[PDB]
Design a protein around this nucleic acid. Sequence first.
RNA 1: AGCCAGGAUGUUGGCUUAGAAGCAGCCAUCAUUUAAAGAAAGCGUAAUAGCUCACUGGUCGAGUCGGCCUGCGCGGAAGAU
Lengths: 286, 38, 141, 176
Amino acid sequence: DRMGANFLKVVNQIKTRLGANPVPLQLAIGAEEHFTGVVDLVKMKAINWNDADQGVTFEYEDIPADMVELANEWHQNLIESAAEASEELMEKYLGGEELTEAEIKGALRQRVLNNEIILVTCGSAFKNKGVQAMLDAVIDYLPSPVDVPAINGILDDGKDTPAERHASDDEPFSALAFKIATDPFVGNLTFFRVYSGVVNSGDTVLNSVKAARERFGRIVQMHANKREEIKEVRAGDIAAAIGLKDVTTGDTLCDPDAPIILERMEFPEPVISIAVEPKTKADQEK
Amino acid sequence: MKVRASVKKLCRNCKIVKRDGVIRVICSAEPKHKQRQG
Amino acid sequence: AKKVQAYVKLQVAAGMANPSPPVGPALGQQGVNIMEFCKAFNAKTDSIEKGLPIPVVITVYADRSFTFVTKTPPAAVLLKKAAGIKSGSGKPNKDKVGKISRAQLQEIAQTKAADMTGADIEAMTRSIEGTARSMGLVVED
Amino acid sequence: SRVAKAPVVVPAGVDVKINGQVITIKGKNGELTRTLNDAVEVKHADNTLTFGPRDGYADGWAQAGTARALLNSMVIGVTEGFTKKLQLVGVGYRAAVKGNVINLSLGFSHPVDHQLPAGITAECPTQTEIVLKGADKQVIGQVAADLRAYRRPEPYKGKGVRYADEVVRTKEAKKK
RNA sequence: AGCCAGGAUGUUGGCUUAGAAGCAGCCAUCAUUUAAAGAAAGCGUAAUAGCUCACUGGUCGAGUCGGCCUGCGCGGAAGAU
């Protein structure tokens, strides 16, 4: 909703600078100030938004008459994007079997596990124009923890046997340690995410890469700000693996007699170095 | 336009024309080389 | 040959494949693949013992084309290839070290006579005596 | 002089109305008249126009030296014309022609739409390029320079409105 | 004085070569062709590509140019019922 904001320029600028292959889907209706419609091209439906409300309507209509031909020349490039994704849609682009909304995404979802095309969407966050539109693609173009290759614990030093473990609750427990913040209540905190398996409350969770013993305290979830005590952590939640005695960047959070990860890749280098000096001589003690 | 009593032809391509009577000296790329009095 | 578009003669010792930064721009004038000028000259560079600056000229053409002329190394660096040091000009008329007679100068001029139409034998002889006096070198025969 | 060695050749298709000091040129698409000063002696001699400085006003070599350059431009301006293109380099800045009015997307809290006088057929191939067409050499610059004076060429980015042939000198920040 | 107009081309011009590559600066300060070119004036610039001065080589086809002396003129020149 700004001047100079050409949607078709930027997505066709990626093919020049970033060198990628983007085929966009949700196009633009409106001259950026009277902007009212976002042109979803699979279902060929424009969406009405709020007069100025923080979120009332979702009214779907047809393609408006002021863009009846740009929808024509851009939908035919959408339905190209499955004939060269899977080899089986090659003979019905030319034969003329109908390219429905549901059929084309079954090929393009498998085009996200290799990542040759990215899926683009224009709209406004602040003007409440597109946010309610942007959620339905996440369940259909962004991958799930059970649709991906799951936890792959290799071994330790014996042999390189990468083992795809299960994404369900039927595995040994596994997690990782990252975003390990602090607090003046308990000391150390984490923002950890469990990939599969279920843990109960109270566990001898180790950190099996650095040979240390830790015990699993009272886990707390947030609204990104507020303390909500999560007792039973299910497979896929993100919480605070509290009470770790020592913890490093990206080591395992795993019960013994189980698969084990040992992985720390791209340890950075903080470059600019400034020397802090105390104010009082009581300060250098603290 | 800086003012000073001396208009000295300073830049290599410095035009001089008498607009209104008071001399002001015309460079091309340098705005710094333009005086007006004298 | 050509005109106000482009004509600069700059090439230094051809043991270095990568275009040296100051030479870069004479290759950075009319859109070359810099791998092409590396692959053009190396078929004949394996007939030399490298160490002297060998010159080429660049000359251009309309679409994406270009051309270049191969000659022999100049006698100015041939004066200071035999003399051992590459830079002797510290004081021209106050240094008297190092002699080469005219016979060396003409046999490095036959390779000019077998390559180029200017830089003739007898006319360059005083300038190959003139690059000696500026370096502070002596000549006798 | 050089101007005295410069007579102007009127072609067929442009008619002169010599009422002495007042000449009204009947041309192709307009009427380019100039009421000159009395330091001139005008005569459309055969076809090539000849002029002369009047006595007393011996500085009329200047005052008709303007005129020799003047009427040459007038007979070629009423027929062929001037392409005066301007280059809009501004973040979110557009240009669009309707009737005889130009919009000015000029980074303000309010739109500026100024109506442009006669002797102007303006056009706009895009949001950054804008044609101006005219018959007098003065009017093809005067309406052009007013737009350029609303947003002068900024010499830290290259921002501003600028002519087609004009080349700015943009500098560098050099401190922060 | 302008439009075409080559900026004929030996060379990297050293030093000290990291670039001080005609264009940072000290000593030389020759010129292969001299109907047009200096081992050189600035900008582009770490260096150069870009743009010129150099001779205007070809067109206009007549006057033109830089200083010395005086007659006068302009600026310099802003004050308080």
